[PDB]
Ligand binder design. Structure first.
Ligand SMILES: O=c1cc(O)n([C@@H]2O[C@H](COP(=O)(O)O)[C@@H](O)[C@H]2O)c(=O)[nH]1
Ligand SMILES: O=c1cc(O)n([C@@H]2O[C@H](COP(=O)(O)O)[C@@H](O)[C@H]2O)c(=O)[nH]1
Lengths: 212, 212
């Protein structure tokens, strides 16, 4: 798009003090911080509250259960200051709707995964990815996760999604295409930022390369 | 089957001490304790070590990410005394293989989800459930999660699985069929045990009803 785009740090380290260090030093160059289970299991879910004072936090919990337990997971995420949560579309509309319902209580957002950026995502997810877009839209999801590693599919997802927010992982370690910026609203980068000698410099340079 | 079957407590409460009280109370009647994110996020991942002193612990983390992240999550589960982990087959063979590889380091087991017992599981998972069985078997998974709520499909899954271990949730709150015992090696029950006035009595009576 023509509009301002985000750089989102996937803070996949396994020490909370290290996470805080990295977030603080790259803060000038990143718009939101995505936290996944390796960090939350290592540091405690409370790490999201601490990180949220630096940038808004996406709870990347890949919620993928029946509605009852999915509801509880979403609630815990929002109780711990997450601005948004990530849910798998493949587990069905009932879970999508319930996670969206919990989110609304908190003014939070829900992102539905279409297909993973890894090769494994092609085995089952790719076949239903566009249908997931449809279901996520109908369920009231606020956005989508879609892969930079399959640019032709990312374009197709954008066409099906309209102006729905799309966040794209895969650039850097997974060798995704920087052309993803044409279709994405936010670019997610983990290793390309934190697994470096100078994370702040890498984040700075990524913005330049992506032209965002 | 003709062999001894397990009753597995899905301990989906959100206080560690409460979990320990319930686990101790029902220990005489249950064979393993399944722990999911509502408890682990609430009490800390260390609750698995405490629970493992009562019965072996299945880390029901619905692992559903790219291999890199999935590997880290599996490792953390096993470092915290889990005897096994649960992974979604839907995310692909690369993640299945990696989670199995981590499990082998610890002598742990991996169960692959075929299709969720909730209605949403019919939307996308049902259509590829049998292929997931094939991929899980090929990847080296030690078992499957399959639904008591769709008994005809459970039968098909058992036939495709050969002698892979199958654990079946859905009995009690989700109104799954007790005929699942015929195909399952273990029966998972959450609310039917813990959401009651007398969990030990409910677990005792469940064994009789299931004839296990
Ligand atoms: O399709 C997806 C969806 C994701 O959330 N992710 C997540 O985005 C991050 C990518 O990190 P990295 O840039 O180091 O490859 C990880 O946290 C991963 O779990 C992904 O890689 N592919
Ligand atoms: O297909 C599945 C797979 C599951 O792991 N589960 C899990 O099994 C447990 C079922 O609990 P309950 O008996 O209260 O319905 C929950 O922890 C749930 O996440 C399920 O219900 N269906």
């Amino acid at each position: 798009g023509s509009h301002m785009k985000q750089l989102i740090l996937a803070l996949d380290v396994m020490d909370g003090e290290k996470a805080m260090e990295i977030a603080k030093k790259v803060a000038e160059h990143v718009d939101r911080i995505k936290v996944n289970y390796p960090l939350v299991l290592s540091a405690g879910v409370g790490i999201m509250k601490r990180l949220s004072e630096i940038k808004p936090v996406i709870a990347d919990f890949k919620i993928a259960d029946v509605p009852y337990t999915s509801s509880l997971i979403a609630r815990i995420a929002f109780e711990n200051s997450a601005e948004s949560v990530i849910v798998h579309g493949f587990v069905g509309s009932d879970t999508l709707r319930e996670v969206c319902r919990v989110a609304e209580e908190f003014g939070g957002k829900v992102y539905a995964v279409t297909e993973l950026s890894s090769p494994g995502g092609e085995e089952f997810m790719s076949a239903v990815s566009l249908k997931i877009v449809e279901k996520a839209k109908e369920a009231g999801c606020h956005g989508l996760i879609a892969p930079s590693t399959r640019i032709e599919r990312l374009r197709e997802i954008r066409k099906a999604a309209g102006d729905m927010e799309i966040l794209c992982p895969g650039i850097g370690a997974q060798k995704g295409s920087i052309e993803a910026v044409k279709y994405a609203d936010g670019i997610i980068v983990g290793r390309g930022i934190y697994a470096s000698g100078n994370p702040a410099e890498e984040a700075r340079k990524l913005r330049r390369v992506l032209k965002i």
